[PDB]
Design a protein around this ligand. Structure first.
Ligand SMILES: *C(=O)[C@@H]([C@@H]1NC(C(=O)O)=C(S[C@@H]2CN[C@H](C(=O)Nc3cccc(C(=O)O)c3)C2)[C@@H]1C)[C@@H](C)O
Ligand SMILES: [Ca+2]
Length: 268
Protein backbone atom coordinates (compact mmCIF):
# COMPACT_ATOMS: atom_id res chain seq x y z
CA UNK A 1 0.00 0.00 0.00
CA UNK A 2 1.54 3.25 -1.21
CA UNK A 3 -0.62 5.30 1.15
CA UNK A 4 0.43 3.10 4.08
CA UNK A 5 4.06 3.79 3.18
CA UNK A 6 3.14 7.49 3.02
CA UNK A 7 1.59 7.37 6.52
CA UNK A 8 4.42 5.29 7.97
CA UNK A 9 7.09 7.57 6.53
CA UNK A 10 5.40 10.69 7.91
CA UNK A 11 5.08 9.04 11.31
CA UNK A 12 8.78 8.13 11.22
CA UNK A 13 9.61 11.78 10.56
CA UNK A 14 7.30 12.88 13.38
CA UNK A 15 8.86 10.45 15.83
CA UNK A 16 12.49 11.11 14.88
CA UNK A 17 12.15 14.90 14.68
CA UNK A 18 9.70 15.32 17.60
CA UNK A 19 7.35 17.02 15.19
CA UNK A 20 3.75 17.11 14.09
CA UNK A 21 3.12 17.07 10.36
CA UNK A 22 -0.22 18.01 8.84
CA UNK A 23 -0.65 17.26 5.13
CA UNK A 24 -3.52 17.28 2.69
CA UNK A 25 -3.26 16.62 -1.04
CA UNK A 26 -6.39 17.20 -3.10
CA UNK A 27 -7.33 16.98 -6.78
CA UNK A 28 -8.53 20.11 -8.65
CA UNK A 29 -12.11 19.54 -7.45
CA UNK A 30 -11.05 19.23 -3.82
CA UNK A 31 -11.31 15.44 -3.62
CA UNK A 32 -8.88 13.93 -1.11
CA UNK A 33 -5.87 12.11 -2.53
CA UNK A 34 -4.00 11.64 0.75
CA UNK A 35 -3.39 13.28 4.07
CA UNK A 36 -2.12 13.15 7.62
CA UNK A 37 -3.58 15.02 10.61
CA UNK A 38 -5.70 16.54 7.83
CA UNK A 39 -8.24 18.16 10.10
CA UNK A 40 -5.96 19.17 12.95
CA UNK A 41 -5.72 22.97 13.34
CA UNK A 42 -2.36 24.68 12.74
CA UNK A 43 -1.38 28.35 12.69
CA UNK A 44 -1.46 29.72 9.13
CA UNK A 45 1.29 32.23 9.70
CA UNK A 46 2.50 33.62 6.33
CA UNK A 47 0.61 31.02 4.27
CA UNK A 48 -2.51 33.20 4.57
CA UNK A 49 -0.88 35.71 2.22
CA UNK A 50 -1.79 33.44 -0.72
CA UNK A 51 -5.55 33.61 0.13
CA UNK A 52 -5.08 37.34 0.78
CA UNK A 53 -3.76 37.79 -2.75
CA UNK A 54 -6.69 35.75 -4.08
CA UNK A 55 -9.10 38.12 -2.29
CA UNK A 56 -7.31 41.07 -3.85
CA UNK A 57 -7.57 39.45 -7.29
CA UNK A 58 -11.26 38.72 -6.73
CA UNK A 59 -11.79 42.42 -6.06
CA UNK A 60 -9.72 43.38 -9.11
CA UNK A 61 -11.75 40.94 -11.22
CA UNK A 62 -14.97 42.45 -9.87
CA UNK A 63 -13.88 46.07 -10.28
CA UNK A 64 -14.15 46.94 -6.58
CA UNK A 65 -10.36 47.32 -6.50
CA UNK A 66 -7.88 48.43 -9.15
CA UNK A 67 -4.48 46.77 -9.45
CA UNK A 68 -2.64 49.98 -10.27
CA UNK A 69 -4.09 51.99 -7.41
CA UNK A 70 -1.39 53.64 -5.31
CA UNK A 71 -1.40 52.83 -1.60
CA UNK A 72 0.39 55.54 0.33
CA UNK A 73 2.24 54.86 3.54
CA UNK A 74 4.83 56.14 5.95
CA UNK A 75 7.43 54.45 8.17
CA UNK A 76 4.61 53.40 10.54
CA UNK A 77 3.86 50.60 8.07
CA UNK A 78 7.29 49.02 8.31
CA UNK A 79 7.37 45.92 10.49
CA UNK A 80 9.95 43.14 10.83
CA UNK A 81 10.72 41.57 7.44
CA UNK A 82 9.37 44.15 5.02
CA UNK A 83 12.04 44.19 2.29
CA UNK A 84 9.96 45.64 -0.56
CA UNK A 85 8.01 48.02 1.70
CA UNK A 86 11.32 49.39 2.97
CA UNK A 87 12.65 49.92 -0.56
CA UNK A 88 9.50 51.71 -1.71
CA UNK A 89 9.18 53.80 1.46
CA UNK A 90 10.91 56.90 0.07
CA UNK A 91 8.68 56.87 -3.02
CA UNK A 92 5.73 56.95 -0.62
CA UNK A 93 3.58 54.15 -2.03
CA UNK A 94 3.19 50.68 -3.49
CA UNK A 95 0.40 49.80 -5.88
CA UNK A 96 -2.14 47.15 -4.92
CA UNK A 97 -0.47 44.71 -7.32
CA UNK A 98 3.08 45.53 -6.20
CA UNK A 99 2.08 45.00 -2.58
CA UNK A 100 0.28 41.74 -3.34
CA UNK A 101 3.25 40.37 -5.28
CA UNK A 102 5.66 41.31 -2.47
CA UNK A 103 3.41 39.64 0.10
CA UNK A 104 3.26 36.44 -1.96
CA UNK A 105 6.83 36.25 -3.27
CA UNK A 106 8.85 37.83 -0.46
CA UNK A 107 6.42 37.30 2.43
CA UNK A 108 6.63 41.07 2.99
CA UNK A 109 4.81 41.89 6.23
CA UNK A 110 4.45 45.63 5.64
CA UNK A 111 2.90 44.94 2.26
CA UNK A 112 0.57 42.42 3.85
CA UNK A 113 -0.64 44.92 6.45
CA UNK A 114 -1.07 47.57 3.74
CA UNK A 115 -3.42 45.24 1.84
CA UNK A 116 -5.20 43.98 4.94
CA UNK A 117 -6.39 47.49 5.67
CA UNK A 118 -7.60 48.06 2.11
CA UNK A 119 -9.69 44.90 1.93
CA UNK A 120 -11.42 45.26 5.30
CA UNK A 121 -9.03 43.73 7.83
CA UNK A 122 -8.95 40.23 9.38
CA UNK A 123 -12.77 40.17 9.51
CA UNK A 124 -12.93 40.65 5.74
CA UNK A 125 -10.22 38.04 5.12
CA UNK A 126 -12.27 35.61 7.16
CA UNK A 127 -15.41 36.52 5.19
CA UNK A 128 -13.54 35.72 1.96
CA UNK A 129 -12.71 32.24 3.26
CA UNK A 130 -16.40 31.71 4.01
CA UNK A 131 -17.41 33.04 0.59
CA UNK A 132 -15.31 30.45 -1.22
CA UNK A 133 -16.61 27.60 0.91
CA UNK A 134 -13.93 27.42 3.60
CA UNK A 135 -15.74 27.36 6.95
CA UNK A 136 -12.56 26.59 8.87
CA UNK A 137 -9.73 29.02 8.13
CA UNK A 138 -9.81 32.23 10.17
CA UNK A 139 -7.75 35.40 10.40
CA UNK A 140 -8.02 37.27 13.69
CA UNK A 141 -4.97 39.54 13.84
CA UNK A 142 -2.55 41.42 11.59
CA UNK A 143 1.25 41.30 11.30
CA UNK A 144 3.21 40.42 13.30
CA UNK A 145 0.92 39.16 16.10
CA UNK A 146 -0.94 36.63 13.92
CA UNK A 147 2.24 34.53 13.92
CA UNK A 148 2.32 34.01 17.70
CA UNK A 149 1.29 30.36 17.32
CA UNK A 150 0.39 30.02 21.00
CA UNK A 151 -0.20 26.32 21.70
CA UNK A 152 -3.91 25.49 21.58
CA UNK A 153 -4.91 28.94 20.28
CA UNK A 154 -7.50 28.68 17.49
CA UNK A 155 -7.00 32.27 16.29
CA UNK A 156 -5.27 32.62 12.91
CA UNK A 157 -5.53 28.90 12.16
CA UNK A 158 -6.55 26.57 9.35
CA UNK A 159 -6.43 22.82 8.77
CA UNK A 160 -4.40 21.14 6.04
CA UNK A 161 -7.58 19.92 4.32
CA UNK A 162 -9.40 23.25 4.52
CA UNK A 163 -6.41 25.10 3.11
CA UNK A 164 -5.67 22.56 0.36
CA UNK A 165 -9.29 22.87 -0.72
CA UNK A 166 -9.04 26.66 -0.65
CA UNK A 167 -5.96 26.46 -2.86
CA UNK A 168 -7.77 24.19 -5.30
CA UNK A 169 -10.79 26.51 -5.39
CA UNK A 170 -8.56 29.49 -6.20
CA UNK A 171 -6.41 27.76 -8.83
CA UNK A 172 -8.79 25.25 -10.38
CA UNK A 173 -12.29 25.95 -9.09
CA UNK A 174 -13.09 29.17 -10.91
CA UNK A 175 -12.70 31.62 -8.03
CA UNK A 176 -10.73 33.98 -10.28
CA UNK A 177 -10.78 34.92 -13.97
CA UNK A 178 -8.48 33.02 -16.31
CA UNK A 179 -6.06 35.97 -16.42
CA UNK A 180 -5.96 36.44 -12.65
CA UNK A 181 -5.64 32.69 -12.06
CA UNK A 182 -2.69 32.54 -14.44
CA UNK A 183 -1.04 35.53 -12.78
CA UNK A 184 -1.33 34.16 -9.24
CA UNK A 185 -0.04 30.77 -10.46
CA UNK A 186 3.05 32.45 -11.94
CA UNK A 187 3.57 34.38 -8.70
CA UNK A 188 3.55 31.10 -6.75
CA UNK A 189 6.01 29.46 -9.16
CA UNK A 190 8.27 32.51 -8.86
CA UNK A 191 8.08 32.68 -5.05
CA UNK A 192 11.50 33.65 -3.67
CA UNK A 193 11.21 32.08 -0.21
CA UNK A 194 10.57 28.41 -0.87
CA UNK A 195 13.75 27.06 -2.47
CA UNK A 196 14.64 24.93 0.58
CA UNK A 197 11.18 23.69 1.56
CA UNK A 198 8.52 21.67 -0.33
CA UNK A 199 9.78 22.26 -3.84
CA UNK A 200 13.24 21.05 -2.79
CA UNK A 201 11.64 17.63 -2.28
CA UNK A 202 9.73 17.47 -5.58
CA UNK A 203 11.00 16.19 -8.97
CA UNK A 204 12.57 18.95 -11.04
CA UNK A 205 10.19 18.44 -13.95
CA UNK A 206 7.06 18.99 -11.85
CA UNK A 207 5.56 22.46 -12.06
CA UNK A 208 5.38 23.65 -8.45
CA UNK A 209 4.21 26.92 -6.92
CA UNK A 210 3.93 27.59 -3.21
CA UNK A 211 3.77 30.01 -0.31
CA UNK A 212 5.85 29.37 2.80
CA UNK A 213 5.30 30.27 6.43
CA UNK A 214 7.48 30.39 9.54
CA UNK A 215 6.14 31.15 12.97
CA UNK A 216 7.02 30.97 16.63
CA UNK A 217 7.07 27.74 18.63
CA UNK A 218 8.49 25.78 15.71
CA UNK A 219 5.98 26.35 12.93
CA UNK A 220 7.09 25.76 9.35
CA UNK A 221 4.49 25.60 6.58
CA UNK A 222 4.21 25.43 2.78
CA UNK A 223 1.03 25.46 0.67
CA UNK A 224 0.41 25.51 -3.06
CA UNK A 225 0.11 23.33 -6.10
CA UNK A 226 2.05 20.89 -8.20
CA UNK A 227 1.57 19.46 -11.65
CA UNK A 228 3.01 16.00 -12.19
CA UNK A 229 2.91 15.61 -15.96
CA UNK A 230 -0.74 16.26 -16.83
CA UNK A 231 -2.07 15.81 -13.31
CA UNK A 232 -2.73 18.87 -11.14
CA UNK A 233 -2.82 18.77 -7.34
CA UNK A 234 -3.29 21.23 -4.49
CA UNK A 235 -1.31 20.67 -1.32
CA UNK A 236 -1.04 22.07 2.18
CA UNK A 237 1.71 21.19 4.64
CA UNK A 238 1.77 22.52 8.19
CA UNK A 239 4.46 21.42 10.64
CA UNK A 240 5.34 22.05 14.27
CA UNK A 241 8.86 21.09 15.38
CA UNK A 242 9.92 23.16 18.43
CA UNK A 243 13.21 21.32 19.00
CA UNK A 244 14.57 21.56 15.44
CA UNK A 245 16.78 24.37 14.19
CA UNK A 246 15.55 26.65 11.39
CA UNK A 247 17.62 24.78 8.78
CA UNK A 248 16.29 21.47 10.12
CA UNK A 249 12.71 22.67 9.83
CA UNK A 250 13.33 23.52 6.15
CA UNK A 251 14.75 20.04 5.65
CA UNK A 252 11.72 18.53 7.40
CA UNK A 253 9.35 20.19 4.94
CA UNK A 254 11.56 19.12 2.01
CA UNK A 255 11.42 15.58 3.42
CA UNK A 256 7.64 15.77 3.40
CA UNK A 257 7.93 16.80 -0.26
CA UNK A 258 9.85 13.59 -0.95
CA UNK A 259 7.23 11.52 0.87
CA UNK A 260 4.50 13.16 -1.22
CA UNK A 261 6.51 12.49 -4.38
CA UNK A 262 6.98 8.81 -3.56
CA UNK A 263 3.23 8.47 -3.14
CA UNK A 264 2.32 10.32 -6.34
CA UNK A 265 4.91 8.44 -8.41
CA UNK A 266 3.86 5.05 -7.04
CA UNK A 267 0.13 5.52 -7.57
CA UNK A 268 0.27 6.26 -11.31
C1 LIG B 1 5.24 34.23 7.67
O1 LIG B 1 5.17 33.14 8.15
C2 LIG B 1 6.36 35.06 8.30
C3 LIG B 1 7.48 35.40 7.29
N1 LIG B 1 7.48 34.47 6.19
C4 LIG B 1 8.46 33.69 6.22
C5 LIG B 1 8.29 32.52 5.47
O2 LIG B 1 8.67 31.41 5.63
O3 LIG B 1 7.76 32.80 4.74
C6 LIG B 1 9.43 34.13 6.96
S1 LIG B 1 10.96 33.48 7.19
C7 LIG B 1 12.05 34.08 6.00
C8 LIG B 1 11.81 35.48 5.49
N2 LIG B 1 12.17 35.27 4.12
C9 LIG B 1 12.91 34.07 4.15
C10 LIG B 1 13.98 33.64 3.20
O4 LIG B 1 15.13 33.89 3.68
N3 LIG B 1 13.74 33.02 2.01
C11 LIG B 1 14.78 32.33 1.52
C12 LIG B 1 15.31 32.74 0.34
C13 LIG B 1 16.41 32.09 -0.19
C14 LIG B 1 17.06 31.07 0.49
C15 LIG B 1 16.60 30.66 1.74
C16 LIG B 1 17.40 29.57 2.49
O5 LIG B 1 17.29 28.38 2.37
O6 LIG B 1 18.29 29.94 3.28
C17 LIG B 1 15.46 31.33 2.26
C18 LIG B 1 12.03 33.11 4.80
C19 LIG B 1 8.94 35.30 7.71
C20 LIG B 1 9.23 35.01 9.18
C21 LIG B 1 5.71 36.28 8.97
C22 LIG B 1 6.76 37.25 9.45
O7 LIG B 1 4.77 36.85 8.11
CA1 LIG C 1 4.09 56.93 9.65
Amino acid sequence: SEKLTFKTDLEKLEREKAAQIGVAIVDPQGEIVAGHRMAQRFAMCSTFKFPLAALVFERIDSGTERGDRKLSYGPDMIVEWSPATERFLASGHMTVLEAAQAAVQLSDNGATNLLLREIGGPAAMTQYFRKIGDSVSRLDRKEPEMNDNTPGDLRDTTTPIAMARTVAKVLYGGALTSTSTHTIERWLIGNQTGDATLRAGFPKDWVVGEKTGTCANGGRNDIGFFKAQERDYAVAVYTTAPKLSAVERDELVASVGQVITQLILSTD
